[PDB]
Amino acid sequence: EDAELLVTVRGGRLRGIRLKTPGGPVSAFLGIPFAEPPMGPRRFLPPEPKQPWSGVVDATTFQSVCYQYVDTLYPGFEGTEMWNPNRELSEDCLYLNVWTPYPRPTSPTPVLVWIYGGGFYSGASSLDVYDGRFLVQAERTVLVSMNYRVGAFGFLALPGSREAPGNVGLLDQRLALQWVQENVAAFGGDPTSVTLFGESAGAASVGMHLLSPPSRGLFHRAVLQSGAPNGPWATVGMGEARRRATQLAHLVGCPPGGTGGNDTELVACLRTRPAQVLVNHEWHVLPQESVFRFSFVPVVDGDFLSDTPEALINAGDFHGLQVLVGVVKDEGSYFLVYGAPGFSKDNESLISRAEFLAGVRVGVPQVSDLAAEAVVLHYTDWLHPEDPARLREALSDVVGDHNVVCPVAQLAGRLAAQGARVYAYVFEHRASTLSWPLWMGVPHGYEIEFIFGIPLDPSRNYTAEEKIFAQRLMRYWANFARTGDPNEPRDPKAPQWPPYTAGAQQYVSLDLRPLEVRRGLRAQACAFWNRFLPKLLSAT
Amino acid sequence: EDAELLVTVRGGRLRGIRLKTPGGPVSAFLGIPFAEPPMGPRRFLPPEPKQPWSGVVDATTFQSVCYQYVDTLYPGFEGTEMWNPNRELSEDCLYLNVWTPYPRPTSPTPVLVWIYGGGFYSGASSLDVYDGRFLVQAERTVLVSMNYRVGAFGFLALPGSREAPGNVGLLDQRLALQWVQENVAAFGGDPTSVTLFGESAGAASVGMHLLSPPSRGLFHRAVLQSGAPNGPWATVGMGEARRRATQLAHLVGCPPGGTGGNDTELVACLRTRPAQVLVNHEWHVLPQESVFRFSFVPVVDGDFLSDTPEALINAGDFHGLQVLVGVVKDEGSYFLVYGAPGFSKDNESLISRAEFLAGVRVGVPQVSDLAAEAVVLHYTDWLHPEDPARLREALSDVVGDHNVVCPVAQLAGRLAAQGARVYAYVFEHRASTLSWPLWMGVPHGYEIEFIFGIPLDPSRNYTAEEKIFAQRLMRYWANFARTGDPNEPRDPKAPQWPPYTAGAQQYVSLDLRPLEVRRGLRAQACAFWNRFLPKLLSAT
Numbered sequence A, B: 001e002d003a004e005l006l007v008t009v010r011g012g013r014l015r016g017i018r019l020k021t022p023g024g025p026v027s028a029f030l031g032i033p034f035a036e037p038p039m040g041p042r043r044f045l046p047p048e049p050k051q052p053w054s055g056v057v058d059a060t061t062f063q064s065v066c067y068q069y070v071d072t073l074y075p076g077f078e079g080t081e082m083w084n085p086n087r088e089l090s091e092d093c094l095y096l097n098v099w100t101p102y103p104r105p106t107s108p109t110p111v112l113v114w115i116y117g118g119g120f121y122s123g124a125s126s127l128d129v130y131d132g133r134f135l136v137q138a139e140r141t142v143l144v145s146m147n148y149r150v151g152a153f154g155f156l157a158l159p160g161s162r163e164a165p166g167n168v169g170l171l172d173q174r175l176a177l178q179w180v181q182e183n184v185a186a187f188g189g190d191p192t193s194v195t196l197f198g199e200s201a202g203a204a205s206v207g208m209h210l211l212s213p214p215s216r217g218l219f220h221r222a223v224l225q226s227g228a229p230n231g232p233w234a235t236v237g238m239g240e241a242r243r244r245a246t247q248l249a250h251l252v253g254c255p256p257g258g259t260g261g262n263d264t265e266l267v268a269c270l271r272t273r274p275a276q277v278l279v280n281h282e283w284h285v286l287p288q289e290s291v292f293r294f295s296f297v298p299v300v301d302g303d304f305l306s307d308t309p310e311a312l313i314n315a316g317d318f319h320g321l322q323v324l325v326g327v328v329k330d331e332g333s334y335f336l337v338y339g340a341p342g343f344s345k346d347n348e349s350l351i352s353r354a355e356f357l358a359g360v361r362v363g364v365p366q367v368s369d370l371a372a373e374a375v376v377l378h379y380t381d382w383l384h385p386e387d388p389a390r391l392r393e394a395l396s397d398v399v400g401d402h403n404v405v406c407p408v409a410q411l412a413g414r415l416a417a418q419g420a421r422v423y424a425y426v427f428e429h430r431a432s433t434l435s436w437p438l439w440m441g442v443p444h445g446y447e448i449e450f451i452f453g454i455p456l457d458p459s460r461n462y463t464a465e466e467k468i469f470a471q472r473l474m475r476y477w478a479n480f481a482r483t484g485d486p487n488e489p490r491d492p493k494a495p496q497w498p499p500y501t502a503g504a505q506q507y508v509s510l511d512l513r514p515l516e517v518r519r520g521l522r523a524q525a526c527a528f529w530n531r532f533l534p535k536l537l538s539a540t
């Protein structure tokens, strides 16, 4: 009844809310504080645990969105506005949400924990597309999602310093995972069966938690959707992080004219600026014209990450770990309208050969001219070297392979070969409701609405076929959370999903059709990025 | 009658011989001297015209083969010994042959001129596979073939010197072309319709006559079979040619210690050595272990070739010229048993990954380690990187593309785009009587027997379809010699052979099946060789 909407955790008491689905109600607890508000002197600092509270905290609505840039490339457009903040911006933003079935499970239930993406500069657990009511109702799992600091507030780093150590946004997620260990049982959740899953920068975050010992003990399985910690955008070096932090300070008048610039004076002036002032100059610190590059991302400082993600992946022992990874069919098309010449969401973007060669430098920033020539060689159809439609898809492949597909395939191979049981997919269904143009195909991030069962929302215009498809994917994800295996444990009727191995490299297609097994996640193109191109740059 | 076996040319009188074919007789004049014997002091010197003679020169049998290395890799094997000399060796070797139909044509007839291949170190016009009786009988054209000096006797060069200028083997071919201009009318041939055709080094020879002005006026059409002058094996630099000539002299005791060693005394000692002694040290002057590399080849001296074949091809006007070029299906397989580790003609040659990587250095000599890495990346199937059968076909593709297909495709594109009418083919029929192993496919040089109508020989075990196939190709070649177009000038029955363009890049498949049009002469692989790899070697 209404008694299940009242729960006591270690910090105090909560009152949740009942949410409706076509198949039955679920109990939600939205806006649970898990940290002290990182404000004033606590800006740029690691999070502190939320101190216990008196009375009943209201947990019936989502809390504030962490301060972040708001996309304005296409005002009023659903394809961009769906990722923008849908609550008020505030630095008081470290809250998490818990969905649990109705009636509350009497047996400990496996827990899914969602980490949203957004290039480490944006995102919120309150987005409509992350609504966990349908996944929890259909599969009777427990779902948790948290907010974490993005942009300068989460990843501004002056390495070696104590006022701005960096990676505090990743520490926000870790504290939320520690909160799950200590409190998810009160909601009927099993803290010994916790499955991480995230998309884009959230998938990279999941990967970085795999490679950080203090976080590895807080979960047991991982799902990386369209992202990996070894991507060229997910990390930066200490020197580059220091340069970006210093230029942001310069752009907001820090330090004042006539003042020294050691790390303590720099962060002190930085903490006096309004949060919106820092956001308004975030993009002006990138070193080049680029797409798929973000200003403040996790830093390789030796603390949260002992080494580079690439080094820790190669030297890692992953025995006893189950991972589910995958990509969408058109990973790069979304990012081309954000800087690549000749591209527009409101036309066919039939680019010229000259625009393609210029776009390669924007899609692959800061590589030698010879490196770009190697990219042009592999991604040109030399029987149709100037066909605009082929050049449009080629540049989409350049950006997608370089940033997502090949970093993911590299991670998946090393994981399977070093003890982990791995499953791989490629998402190939384009939503009937998709507002982005047709030439973008299945863009980055548009499998999420199907994983979360959004087609089940009666207020939306999805097809009957898409609803069955969403239930299939929810079963896959929940089966993996329960058993580490997406296949139905006692259903041999359905085509089986074989594990991914470094040799066979098997993955399955996810669309309206039944499962189909394929081999190689762009093995030819990814050999160029993962094997030859590094050798080309070391020889300059 | 027997009257047609008596012909007078500018040098004197000749007596020919009548040859039988299943379709009727032809009149052959074998062993016509066109040059003074390049003996003694004339070794390494350009040819001089044959002085007129008294009486009737007997032209009823083939003359001597120019001194050359004889293959002994597989003693008694048909696949190798069919290319070995079938007449005695001698420096007295500059003779040509003329086949003409019976009855002799009363109207001027198009003339075909054959230039044999053999890596510029071997070959002879007397080889059984070059028998011109079937082509002349079936198509009623005039066929001419000449001997030219090979090895050191034809291409040893101390550039700048007058005792050994180099390229004298090419001058041998030119003198034979001047002979055709002055005497082929006596056999019923049209000196205004002369079509050159050759294979391998002969095709490279045809290409070098296109790029040499003094020879360009001696012919009107060209056919390049599995060879091009821009191949990495067909030419050599002045400095490298001097080094090879000097080490050959050293290996035979020139200069005598301890006397000087300028170019005149070096050649003087060289001219005293027996011809077999020079041949016995020819292979010991190559710089490294390799396949598809030959010691003494045309040199870029500034004389016969004013610049590199690549430079002359790019800056050339080819309006008013018709060219027919093509390759066989497996250009590289023949050469792998001559040095590539793990290869044998008497087993399946299922090489290992380590053998493939070592073979790449042999198939592509004198390139940086990074260049070899780029070759390995492009020719590895990264879904089956260790499969022996795929590695075997990959190394054959490496040697074939690098040496034949991509040099030919580069030449064909530049010619069509700069005025020449071009036709392209890929020969895909493997002879039923082929003694090379099955894994070699259609090896380098095994379209020749079909062009010359050898299946028509009743003493051979060719199939019925292969005889019709040979007649069809003989018409293609003769139609091109007559009109510059391999297609039938009237017949719309058979599918048509479209010209080759730099854009559409259309070519036809030559096999038992009717003509099939395809696009791209291995366009993707040849972009690596022709576009990217030169840039990779520039930046070391």
Ligand SMILES: *[C@](C)(O)CCC[N+](C)(C)C
Residues within 6 Å of the ligand: A083, A117, A118, A119, A120, A199, A200, A201, A202, A444, A445
């Ligand atoms: C990834 C780098 O996090 C990109 C995420 C972009 N959205 C719009 C899909 C969140």
Ligand SMILES: *[C@](C)(O)CCC[N+](C)(C)C
Residues within 6 Å of the ligand: B083, B117, B118, B119, B120, B199, B200, B201, B202, B444, B445
């Ligand atoms: C080409 C380089 O001349 C090779 C010719 C080899 N034969 C055996 C086909 C003549």
